[PDB]
């Protein structure tokens, strides 16, 4: 007769949602992402390959991206608290122009105002340079941008904005499954799955239209979306070859310190030593047509073979979603992308210069819960960044059902889609080590 | 691609019977009730799921690419225009 036996430690897992912890790298100083309380990672990762198993992955429902979206807000908004808040900066300004020869004449403003001295019975008349996007006219006689919906605090000068790679490691009893299948879209089974202790280096890069410094594909350009039919879903594109972009800010700025209280300083912007120039970005025009020529080849798999695929620029919204925004060198850029997405693809040494704009008063993450904004201090010197373009975030226009014409426009805004492109191949499971099986053994009495 | 067909163009059946209107479409499909000069009102969504606030005399079911709207126990205030709604494609519905 057969008898039931109890086995402990069987390789059986189930889907579950747990709280993964961080894991940084070795320290050879400070930043807004608290990469000092994380546990140090192992010098070599242990990736055990799993054979004869077809695990079903599911994008757009993973809890790992929903947890990383909360962890970034809980670190970006908790670093603006301890250092100085610029609540007396909402005084009335007297702004004059800087550029003499008009053509942009009106980008920079030379504003002077009355600031509080460290002795609170006298006042000083100081001056500073502000951009046009940070000032509004009251009825000259300007003020800051909002001064009515937000309490402007200064971004903290000792911490940095550099996105360093972090890892997300599972606790005891849980495991992370990595899908290594090349021809694998968002939703579907994965017959090539292995386990890891935790993931690769995920850099928390904040961008809207172009995914900068991301993970590339293996063989061809992959196009992932929740549903191609629903036009309200942003189409995520992942490149297989990198597109190098060179962004710069050639204005040699100087930083002056203004004491606005006892032990509280405010970093204004002094004179600009040199020429007044405009920040811009450069991409290779030969590489951009080669990269866009592969996306139009992969887009025709979900649509007709002889359809006309167009690329238009953004339709509107606030400045964050209609322009390519990033954090090159600590300063926030807003680049006009009307030169990239301007093409029409009929079936069958030069560089593109993208004019950008600089902003200093930034409101992110819906005001950090209540109303709070951020004032980035000016970075002294010339700034230049070299990064990769490893994917786009498109949005198809609806209503097109005849004429075989589909137009794709860049979108963004939802910061979760920046981490959908990184955490799409991972899934957390929960080990259930109890199992029963019939055996011809017996308990010795 | 989305394909639409609406064969019951017009029907004027009496009260008390059981009438059904059909439309063939792929994807999600919602049903709406629209009076003359008034705003449309959602009756059922996803083919068969019922919306809170709609009376229980409305029911629907699907089989492949055929959605049906069952109308039993008609009322004097239940004579309006009904059309099925894919995302951005709305066919001109029929009146009772």
């Amino acid at each position: 007769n057969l008898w039931v036996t109890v086995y402990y430690g069987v390789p059986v897992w189930k889907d579950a949602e747990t709280t993964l912890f961080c894991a940084s790298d070795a320290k050879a100083k400070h930043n807004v992402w608290a990469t000092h309380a994380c546990v140090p990672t192992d010098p070599n990762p242990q990736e055990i390959h799993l054979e004869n198993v077809t695990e079903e992955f599911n994008m757009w429902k993973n809890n790992m991206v929903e947890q990383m979206h909360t962890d970034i807000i809980s670190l970006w908004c908790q670093s603006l608290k301890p250092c100085v808040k610029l609540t007396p900066l909402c005084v009335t300004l007297q702004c004059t122009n800087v550029t003499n020869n008009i053509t942009m004449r009106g980008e920079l403003k030379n504003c002077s105002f009355n600031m509080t001295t460290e002795l609170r019975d006298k006042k000083q008349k100081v001056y500073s340079l502000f951009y046009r996007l940070d000032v509004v006219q009251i009825n000259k006689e300007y003020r800051l941008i909002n001064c009515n919906t937000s309490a402007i605090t200064q971004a903290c000068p000792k911490v940095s904005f550099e996105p360093i790679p972090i890892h997300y490691c599972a606790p005891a009893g849980f495991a992370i499954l990595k899908c290594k299948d090349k021809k694998f879209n968002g939703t579907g089974p994965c017959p090539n799955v292995s386990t890891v202790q935790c993931t690769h280096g995920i850099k928390p890069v904040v961008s809207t239209q172009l995914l900068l410094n991301g993970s590339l594909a293996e063989e061809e350009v992959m196009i992932r979306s929740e549903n191609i039919t629903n036009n309200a879903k942003n189409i995520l594109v992942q490149f297989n070859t990198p597109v190098q972009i060179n962004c710069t800010r050639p204005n040699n700025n100087t930083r002056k310190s203004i004491r606005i209280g006892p032990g509280q300083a405010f970093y204004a912007t002094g004179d600009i030593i040199g020429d007044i120039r405009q920040a811009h970005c450069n991409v290779s025009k030969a590489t951009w047509n080669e990269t866009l020529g592969k996306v139009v080849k992969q887009l025709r798999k979900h649509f007709g073979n002889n359809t006309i695929i167009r690329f238009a620029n953004s339709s509107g919204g606030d400045l964050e979603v209609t322009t390519h925004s990033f954090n090159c060198g600590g300063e926030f850029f807003y680049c006009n992308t009307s030169g990239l997405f301007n093409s029409t693809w009929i079936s069958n040494n030069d560089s593109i210069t993208l004019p950008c704009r600089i902003k200093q008063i930034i409101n992110m993450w819906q005001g950090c819960g209540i109303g709070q904004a951020m004032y980035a201090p000016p970075i002294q010197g010339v700034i230049r960044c070299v990064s990769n373009i490893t994917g786009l975030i498109l949005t198809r226009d609806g209503g097109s059902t005849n004429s075989t014409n589909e137009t794709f426009r860049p979108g963004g805004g939802d910061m979760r889609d920046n981490w959908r492109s990184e955490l799409y191949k991972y899934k957390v499971v929960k080990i259930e080590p109890l199992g029963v099986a019939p055996t011809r053994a017996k308990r010795r009495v | 691609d989305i394909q639409m067909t609406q064969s019951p163009s017009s029907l004027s059946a009496s009260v008390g019977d059981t009438v059904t209107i059909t439309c063939q479409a792929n994807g999600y499909l919602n049903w709406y009730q629209q009076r003359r000069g008034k705003a449309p009102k959602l009756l059922i969504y996803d083919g068969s799921k019922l919306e809170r606030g709609v009376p229980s005399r409305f029911s629907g079911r699907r089989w492949g690419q055929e959605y049906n709207l069952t109308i039993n126990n008609l009322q004097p205030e239940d004579i309006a225009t009904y059309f099925c709604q894919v995302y951005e494609f709305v066919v001109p519905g029929t009146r009772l």
Partner: nanobody, 121 residues
Framework: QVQLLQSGAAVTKPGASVRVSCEASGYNIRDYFIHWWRQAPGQGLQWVGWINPKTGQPNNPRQFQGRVSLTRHASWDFDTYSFYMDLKALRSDDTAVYFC????????????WGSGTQVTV
């Protein structure tokens, strides 16, 4: 409590610009899209486009690009909104009534609508 207020009717000339308002009050606005619909007298509905209330990015078909500009406005306390719809150059066949829908889920459930604003040229 969930209501979408509608603005009054307006009569203009061919070549002017109109504006139709829509105020959402009694729900969480930032988590649900707001669409716009239009029906001609004697015909069925026609899609105008949606607008993301969180970001502001609009969407419009090929037959409406360059004319309609969807714009939203939020208050200081973010409890009520003001969704606008400005037409650039009205034609002769634009005499219709405009609605203000609200997408609930991924099945595009427009449970709550507007009262309707009929404009003529």
């Amino acid at each position: 409590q969930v209501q979408l207020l509608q603005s009054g009717a307006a009569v203009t000339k061919p070549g002017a610009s109109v504006r139709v308002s829509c105020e959402a009050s009694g729900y969480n606005i930032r988590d649900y899209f707001i669409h716009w619909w239009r029906q001609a007298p004697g015909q069925g509905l026609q899609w105008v486009g949606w607008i993301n209330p969180k970001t502001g990015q609009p969407n419009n078909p090929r037959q409406f690009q360059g004319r309609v500009s969807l714009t939203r406005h939020a208050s200081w306390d973010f409890d009520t909104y003001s969704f606008y719809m400005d037409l650039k150059a009205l034609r002769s066949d634009d005499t219709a009534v405009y609605f203000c829908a609200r997408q609930r889920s991924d099945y595009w459930d427009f449970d709550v609508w507007g009262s309707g604003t009929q404009v003529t040229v």
